[PDB]
């Protein structure tokens, strides 16, 4: 094992590889969400932009995890990336619900890795997750909750008009 | 025939003259659409601007075809320009449907000329159409499809209010 | 099928989805190559940068194909992404050989799609591939051939020293 | 004891004094390494600069620990500083191996203090170490591992030439 590796368990090394797979799967789900909203029969440019930006954020998350794996002397192992759960994502409301479920799953994977690091007494891992992931995930989930509330308030009223207004006046 | 003319069939020369007529007819249709939306009893400035800009694009298309006709040593022949199909264009939805039908007809005329150029082994014509027309037409048809979807989503909800919002928040 | 779709075969639509999968698989292979070269026991920063930049290029290729799919009124369909062919990539020479084999496979997939577009008389597809893919692929394969020649000239001489010099004086 | 001291154990206070001694000992070792590489019969300016910069980093580490000791109301106690382990440091490879062993020892002292802070429920200490020391130490050890790999690849090939090239083309 590495000349540099110190206090870095095989359990954390494997969990980090699994977390990379989860973040790349999430990036791929957001790519599908973004292009769905660019369809000529869906055509919500602000929604497409919101999800394409999240695809980039999740890929950057995966890349940060891979850099950290190499800095600790672990070995990156890539697995197949499962396709997204849907081919078509319904309304803006349906899509934002699917996104908040996906973010909560990433959050729970972060909290599980944090607990593993704590059990393995790995403060560099705990610091890394706290610094680069946990606060960003909480902020993103809160933003998605705010969006869900605003979408629901609008499409209860008058569904097509409310989806247009949310895209025009909240998203860009 | 020209001192410059080389590999330029009489079939392509005639089809180019017909395509100029189609583009000028389209420019004239967009002029009528634009001024309809400027009527005091229609009054959708963003819609008028959208169609007036397309009138200019179609005239520029015709002018590019005429320049190319002279560059190849063909002879421009102008015919009567038929008036537009309607005097009044209904709602924004009606108008955008009429526009996408007109763009699909220009697209099919481009594809027909491309096929003629291919049959006549005229790669300069094929390159000209690919470079200046085919991609612009696909992009425009996609934009009109996106508009149709957004208009339909809005005027299903509440017709007059939805037409106002589309003009204010999408068009300018 | 789409309000916008015109002259866009189901055969091309499916081949475009397959080509997106190939480009995303290639992006993933380049991500693995890049992080392999960042390992503390490999440590060739210029090589890691070369492959990470190609990971971004291949993802941008996939995104361009998806935009084009929507512009033509086709429907993006995502499949599972197969993991890369290796977990460890050997020397710079081994890696550059694996990269040129992967680029030739993408090139052959582009040429196959071009031939399908030609058989289906789809000049917009032929133009799209010629404009955004075919010349970039030829230029990249030539650059990789130049690299392979320089690496082979260096590591024939004195393997570790030659790999260091190539990374320091050609790559960045 | 201090008017300001709160939740700051005598065990942590003593361990912080010991850690200051370790960091100043490391600074002194890097001073000796730097001046060894400036000898007219060694003469590797980039290597001398690398170690002199680390001498400054380790002294800054000690100074940060002393500031923190006073901020918590502990009392700085200075002990004799042991001379470095060698008077002459051999090749660049020998020196970089000695440096990575010294950094791993500082890292293990940081992890031991983190574990003590955790046992004493001292989150300010845990935060201080995570913020200013743990990530810097991991990044430095990874950089030294990368250097060791590159030096070994070069001096396996042709020892004197490889040491020159590493100094000229990696270090400055
Ligand atoms: Cl372990
Ligand atoms: Cl002829
Ligand atoms: Cl078909
Ligand atoms: Cl105490
Ligand atoms: Na370890
Ligand atoms: Na769980
Ligand atoms: Na937002
Ligand atoms: Na001719
Ligand atoms: Na026809
Ligand atoms: Na527009
Ligand atoms: Na079609
Ligand atoms: Na083939
Ligand atoms: Na290059
Ligand atoms: Na205390
Ligand atoms: Na210990
Ligand atoms: Na350095």
Author numbering:
A (entry chain A), B (entry chain A), C (entry chain A), D (entry chain A): 1 to 172
What does the report in the manuscript say about this coordinate set?
Among proteins, a special position is occupied by the ferritin superfamily since it has been shown that these proteins can selectively deliver anticancer drugs to cancer cells. Arsenoplatin-1 ([Pt(µ-NHC(CH3)O)2ClAs(OH)2]), also called AP-1, is the most representative member of this class.
The AP-1-encapsulated horse spleen apo-ferritin (AFt) was prepared following the alkaline pH procedure previously reported for cisplatin-encapsulated AFt. Briefly, the protein cage is disassembled at basic pH and then reassembled in the presence of a large amount of the metallodrug (a protein subunit to AP-1 molar ratio of 1:50 was used). AP-1-encapsulated AFt was then crystallized and X-ray diffraction data on these crystals were collected at 1.50 Å at high resolution at ESRF synchrotron in Grenoble, France. Upon reaction with the protein, an AP-1 fragment that has lost the chloride ligand binds the side chain of His49 retaining the Pt-As bond. The Pt(II) center coordinates the ND1 atom of the histidine side chain; the Pt-ND1 distance is 2.5 Å. One of the OH groups bound to As interacts with the side chain of Arg52 and with a water molecule. Since more than one molecule of AP-1 per AFt chain is present, analysis of the protein structure points out that there are a lot of free AP-1 molecules trapped within the bulk.
